[PDB]
Design a protein around this ligand. Structure first.
Ligand SMILES: Cc1cccc(N(C)C(=O)N2CC[C@H](C(N)=O)C2)c1
Ligand SMILES: [Zn+2]
Length: 140
């Protein structure tokens, strides 16, 4: 579990969105595993606006933050899970790092701010859903 809180937005994995998230929906995209809902209180996270390929992510199944090198956002094949059939997920970045199913939500960050959130993984891989292209998170 985990979310990004920027301005009056809450960014979560679409497959973990709550009823309150769907009832206060701003935007969702199944192909990216992302959903954004509105919040009453203002958040403290800042979104990175960069092309960094190194950063640090939070792994809840180890209670640790790990430095990682990650790929550029791309269209990657993902294997079936309890939440999605085997399919191509867009704007996904891969890194080598421990990950387990309930780690989705953990933040990946660089020197500029939040880069994305854990969305996939397994066998020593960890996949991140990128948010750096969502410029509208910075306003209104
Ligand atoms: C972090 C982790 C570790 C091992 C496996 C995973 N996967 C395979 C997983 O639970 N899902 C559920 C939906 C997600 C997706 N974005 O398609 C894939 C994640
Ligand atoms: Zn950066």
């Amino acid at each position: 579990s985990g979310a990004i809180y920027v301005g009056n937005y809450r960014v979560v994995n679409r497959h973990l969105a709550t009823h309150n998230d769907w009832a206060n929906l701003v935007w969702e995209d199944s192909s990216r595993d992302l959903l954004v809902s509105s919040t009453t209180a203002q958040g403290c996270d800042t979104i990175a606006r960069c092309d960094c390929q190194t950063g640090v992510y939070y792994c809840s199944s180890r209670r640790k933050h790990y430095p990682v090198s990650f790929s550029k956002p791309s269209l990657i094949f993902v294997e079936a899970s309890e939440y999605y059939p085997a399919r191509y997920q867009s704007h996904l970045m891969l890194a080598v790092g421990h990950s387990e199913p309930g780690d989705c939500g953990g933040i990946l960050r660089c020197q500029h701010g939040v880069v994305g959130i854990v969305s996939t993984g397994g066998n020593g891989l960890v996949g991140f859903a990128d948010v750096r292209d969502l410029l509208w998170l910075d306003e209104e």
